[PDB]
Amino acid sequence: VVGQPRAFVLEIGTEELPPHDVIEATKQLEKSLIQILEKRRLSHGKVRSYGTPRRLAVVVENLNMKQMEEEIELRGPPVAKAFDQEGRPTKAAEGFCRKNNVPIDSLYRRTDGKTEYIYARVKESARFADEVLTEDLPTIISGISFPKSMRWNSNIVFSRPIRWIFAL
Amino acid sequence: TIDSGVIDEVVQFVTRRLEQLLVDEGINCEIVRSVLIERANCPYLASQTAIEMEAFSRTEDFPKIVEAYSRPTRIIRGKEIGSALEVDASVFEKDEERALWSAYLEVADKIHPGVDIKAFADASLELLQPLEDFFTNVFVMAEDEKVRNNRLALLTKVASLPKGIADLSVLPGF
RNA sequence: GCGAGCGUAGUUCAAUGGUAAAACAUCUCCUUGCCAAGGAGAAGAUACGGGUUCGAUUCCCGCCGCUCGCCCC
Incomplete structure (x- = not known):
């Protein structure tokens, strides 16, 4: 069910970090995070990051509970290739239809380039704006890099051991 | 004992660092890249x-x-046949090339390797006008060996003036 | 040996599961003849091999060579 945009807090509580790594990490995190939600068509507000020798917090305000369910026009094969002079459309048209699960009548012609185009309208599969973060955060956290690193109980590279994660 | 290649290597290294320093205050790369080769x-x-x-x-x-x-x-x-000799006032053709040579002789006085660029263009502006008439009315095509060699030598010595001030190859306008 | 990054006209570079784009250099030509200056055209390419799909410069794997750490020093 749809609600209202509420705050989003991410904290990675580690042990003591060098004075010349908090500055780098608090930027590498926020700059790369204000991009993923744009990739996943999320709507945020004022994003700000904070650093401390024991935590690297990022606060994003007014994050919606849903994605923007909108239709997008794809770009299929050239019209000449997919449609013959006479008869039924060639194998490319049916392959496109069965790939995107759309009726044949939905195809329309728009003029661009030498061969004009073949175009179709498809949905975007709006999720619940929480599974996306669940599946994406393990990459945004692990995308940080440092000049020096170590391991404590696994094969994960980080500047200092991580002791807790507070993602709300 | 150190061979003569190391000194050239060091000079090239210092020149490459000077270029990096000079491109730090907003100077165009193609300008310093042309000045520093000379x-x-x-x-x-x-x-x-x-x-x-x-x-x-x-x-x-x-x-x-x-x-x-x-x-x-x-x-x-x-062709490099015209580099054997220099100009002369015996086999010279119609007054166009003579006027160009006179203008070149006049302008060469103010251009020496110890000059700066303040008066460079102000002195080179007077040479431009006869150049068009020359290139349009002399037919520098090599039909006679002597006249071809003389014209090539004159043209080379005309074009060799900036040798000592700056180079016009890495020039953006080109 | 052990990791990463790579590979597109001769050089520099565009894009994404689908008829390969642009500058520059070369060439063919139209201006009065040779360079400059205006125009038109031509040719020019995905390092290599395989797999799947109707179809990959794009996804997976093998190899080639380059660049950087580590190994050695």
Whole structure:
């Protein structure tokens, strides 16, 4: 069910970090995070990051509970290739239809380039704006890099051991 | 004992660092890249020449001089038979080439390797006008060996004036 | 040996599961003849091999060579 945009807090509580790594990490995190939600068509507000020798917090305000369910026009094969002079459309048209699960009548012609185009309208599969973060955060956290690193109980590279994660 | 290659290597390294320093205050890369291939000996001279030539390049007349000075340069490459001799006043053709040679002799007095660029274009502007008439009315095509050699030598010595001030190859206008 | 990054006209570079784009250099030509200056065209390419799909410069794997750490020093 749809609600209202509420705050989003991410904290990675580690042990003591060098004075010349908090500055780098608090930027590498926020700059790369204000991009993923744009990739996943999320709507945020004022994003700000904070650093401390024991935590690297990022606060994003007014994050919606849903994605923007909108239709997008794809770009299929050239019209000449997919449609013959006479008869039924060639194998490319049916392959496109069965790939995107759309009726044949939905195809329309728009003029661009030498061969004009073949175009179709498809949905975007709006999720619940929480599974996306669940599946994406393990990459945004692990995308940080440092000049020096170590391991404590696994094969994960980080500047200092991580002791807790507070993602709300 | 150190061979003579190490000193050249060090000079090249210092020149490459000087270029990096000079491109740090907003100087165009193609300008310093052209100045430093000829003024790399004294760093202060290079720094005071490349900081001023860029400022002069906005006089709206800079492309005119760039086009004219080295329009002759692109024919030099190829045949080198004309480098054997120099100019003379015996086999000279109609008064167009004589006027161009006189203008060249007049302008060569103010151009020496110890000059700066302040009066460079102001003295080179007078040479441009006879150049068009020359290239349009002499037919520098090599039909006679003597006249071809003489014309090639005259053209090379005309185009060799900036040898000592700056080069016009890495020039953007080209 | 052990990791990463790579590979597109001669050089520099565009894009994404689908008829390969642009500058520059070369060439063919139209201006009065040779360079400059205006125009038109031509040719020019995905390092290599395989797999799947109707179809990959794009996804997976093998190899070639380059660049950087580590190994050695």
